[PDB]
Amino acid sequence: SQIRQNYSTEVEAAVNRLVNLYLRASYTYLSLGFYFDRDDVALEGVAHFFRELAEEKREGAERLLKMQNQRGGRALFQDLQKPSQDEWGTTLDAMKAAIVLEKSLNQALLDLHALGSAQADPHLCDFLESHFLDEEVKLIKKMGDHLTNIQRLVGSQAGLGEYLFERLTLK
């Protein structure tokens, strides 16, 4: 590289790790998306919600990789761990798992921003805010809103509430 400037080896490594985290998250959402498409689950709005998230996280990884090259860093890929579950339970179980996942990505972004601040790397810190940190806050708020509505619908008839949420809130 003849372009690298103010781009630390620590940040370069952390960016590669964040790419792996984003790709893992995409893979997790892919699994969630197909689980809700199972004939014995059959909640299309829920499937669509997670399938859209799979694509968003893949896009996030690609944006990070583009930035790595723009800065003169070098992409290094690692194995992608399979998702933590094969079956994801109820919509409530899935939304809880999704919020946990998003909080972990958000924390990884915050950790990287902190490293950028420590390294005096303003291009990095601003890139993370613009493309990632703002989107995370919005997504987490939406999931929290969803969790609240799912929870209020459990009542004594969980099946009815699960159907209604998918029909009236999602897709």
Tokens of 107: 């924390």
State how far the alpha carbon of 5 is from the alpha carbons of 18, 101, 118, 121, 141, in Å: 21, 33, 16, 10, 36
Please enumerate in sequence order all residues whose Cβ is within 8 A of that of 41, keeping only pairs 6 or more positions apart, or say none.
35
Least Å distance, CB 137 to Pd ion, is: 15
Q: Which of 65, 125, 128, 143 binds Pd ion (CB under 5 A)?
A: 125
Q: Residue 128, interface with Pd ion (CB under 5 A)?
A: no
Residue 135 is assigned to a ligand binding site: no
Q: Stretches 25-33, 82-90, 119-127, 132-140: which one binds Pd ion (CB under 5 A)? A: 119-127
CA distance 77 to 167: 39
Q: Residue 112, interface with Pd ion (CB under 5 A)?
A: no
Least Å distance, CB 17 to Pd ion, is: 19
Residue 102 is assigned to a ligand binding site: no
